[PDB]
Amino acid sequence: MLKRMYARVYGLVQGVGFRKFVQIHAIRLGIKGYAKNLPDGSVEVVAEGYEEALSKLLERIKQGPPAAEVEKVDESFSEYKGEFEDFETY
């Protein structure tokens, strides 16, 4: 069940190891896509992979790394486009 998952992460989420934490867990789970800093201070994640893997990554995203303080994750699921070959951070 390949899917694409979009996640917007609000809170104390920049300067705290967030993008690397998502990347590591994505690589561990076989997920491709990206985690990106946004100018407003939040982070966005686009992830493609099997549903079960995406759900595991979502759980990680909601927690964040130890220095993060996640206020809310907004997520949305949609069709897998097979757009990515790696998991990148920007």
Swiss-Prot record:
It catalyses: an acyl phosphate + H2O = a carboxylate + phosphate + H(+). GO terms for molecular function: acylphosphatase activity. Optimum temperature is 81 degrees Celsius. Thermostable up to 100.8 degrees Celsius. Poorly active at 25 degrees Celsius. Enzymatic activity is increased 4-fold by temperature increase from 25 to 45 degrees Celsius and more than 9-fold at 98 degrees Celsius. Pfam families: Acylphosphatase. Optimum pH is 4.7-5.7. It comes from the Archaea. Keywords: Hydrolase. Transmembrane segments: none annotated. Residues 4-90 form the Acylphosphatase-like domain. The active site is at R19, N37. Its EC number is 3.6.1.7. Belongs to the acylphosphatase family. This is Acylphosphatase. It comes from Saccharolobus solfataricus (strain ATCC 35092 / DSM 1617 / JCM 11322 / P2). The lineage of its organism: Archaea, Thermoproteota, Thermoprotei, Sulfolobales, Sulfolobaceae. The gene is acyP.
